[PDB]
Enzyme design. Structure first.
Site, PDB file in Angstrom:
ATOM      1  CB  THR A 207      53.984   1.858  44.567  1.00  0.00           C
ATOM      2  OG1 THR A 207      54.921   0.777  44.671  1.00  0.00           O
ATOM      3  CG2 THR A 207      52.975   1.752  45.705  1.00  0.00           C
ATOM      4  CB  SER A 208      56.074   4.562  40.415  1.00  0.00           C
ATOM      5  OG  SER A 208      55.014   5.030  39.602  1.00  0.00           O
TER       6      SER A 208
ATOM      7  CG  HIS B  37      54.743  -4.149  41.202  1.00  0.00           C
ATOM      8  ND1 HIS B  37      55.474  -3.938  42.349  1.00  0.00           N
ATOM      9  CD2 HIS B  37      54.328  -2.926  40.791  1.00  0.00           C
ATOM     10  CE1 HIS B  37      55.514  -2.644  42.614  1.00  0.00           C
ATOM     11  NE2 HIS B  37      54.821  -2.009  41.686  1.00  0.00           N
ATOM     12  N   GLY B  38      55.459  -8.527  40.835  1.00  0.00           N
ATOM     13  CA  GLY B  38      55.065  -9.899  40.588  1.00  0.00           C
ATOM     14  C   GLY B  38      54.625 -10.603  41.847  1.00  0.00           C
TER      15      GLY B  38
ATOM     16  CB  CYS C 286      57.659  -9.752  44.579  1.00  0.00           C
ATOM     17  SG  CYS C 286      58.411  -8.289  45.280  1.00  0.00           S
TER      18      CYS C 286
END
Lengths: 4, 239, 4
Positions: free
Chosen positions: B34-35, B93-94, B135
């Site tokens: 997601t954005s 993101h991660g 994350c």
């Protein structure tokens, strides 16, 4: 608030 | 001369050095990611914050995994002889050990290896700072009421969150961690050593933020950032 | 090289  | 001490990195080279900011907000549909709204707030905050510390800031937006690696490779191959330090900020993101490009994952180790003491010689013995808003897993914190050097030396990894945990981002104010990082850098960069600044960041995130969600699974959660230091001296942004 |  949102998680990544 | 008189007595001399050497407990602090030399930060009076002609340039403070580069600050690379990788800001990934929009992801290829095929990934299903997601954005990341609010992240532009973060990137502009960092740009201004590090500009005032006299870093040459380069903002890069929405990079593929291939572009991320190519950028870091190219940057690590620049001549950093006249620069005191290197800074890299990753906003994406991660999960543990991983940061996402727009089309898929990148190993954090693959990125930082470019800057190892033996592979980037003009940064050998200089502080290499990686600031990671991403994350590191899916755990939620419910809180409680109150003649050679190692090639891995001189790295500092300022993680937004504890190993194994989600990292929190507010779509209007930006990520909790980057919000706090910039505020504490603005207020204390001319006074405190960097570890002590990052500890203040820890306290701010730990005490002043708590999630609000209509979803009970994600409501009232807390966050503590994680400083991982392989530095060998004290780091002051002034001289 | 700068996007921002």
């Amino acid at each position: 608030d949102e998680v990544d | 001369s008189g007595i001399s001490l050497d407990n602090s990195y030399k930060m009076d080279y002609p340039e403070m050095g580069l600050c690379i900011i990788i800001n990934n907000k929009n992801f290829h549909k095929s990934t299903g990611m997601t954005s990341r709204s609010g992240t532009d707030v973060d990137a502009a905050n960092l740009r201004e914050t590090f500009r005032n510390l006299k870093y040459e800031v380069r903002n890069k937006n929405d990079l593929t995994r291939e572009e991320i690696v190519e950028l870091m490779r190219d940057v690590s191959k620049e001549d950093h002889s006249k620069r005191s330090s290197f800074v890299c900020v990753l906003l994406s993101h991660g999960e543990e050990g991983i940061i996402f490009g727009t089309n898929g994952p990148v190993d954090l180790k693959k990125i930082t290896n470019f800057f190892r003491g033996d592979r980037c010689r003009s940064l050998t013995g200089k502080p290499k700072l990686f600031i990671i808003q991403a994350c590191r897993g899916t755990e939620l914190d419910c809180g409680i009421e109150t003649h050679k050097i190692p090639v891995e030396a001189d790295f500092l990894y300022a993680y937004s969150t504890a190993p194994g945990y989600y990292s929190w981002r507010n779509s209007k104010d930006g990520s909790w961690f980057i919000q706090s990082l910039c505020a504490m850098l603005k207020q204390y960069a001319d006074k405190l050593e960097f570890m002590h600044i990052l500890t203040r960041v820890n306290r701010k995130v730990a005490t002043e933020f708590e999630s609000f969600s209509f979803d009970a699974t994600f409501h009232a959660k807390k966050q503590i950032p994680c400083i991982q230091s392989m530095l060998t001296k004290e780091l002051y942004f002034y001289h | 090289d700068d996007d921002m």
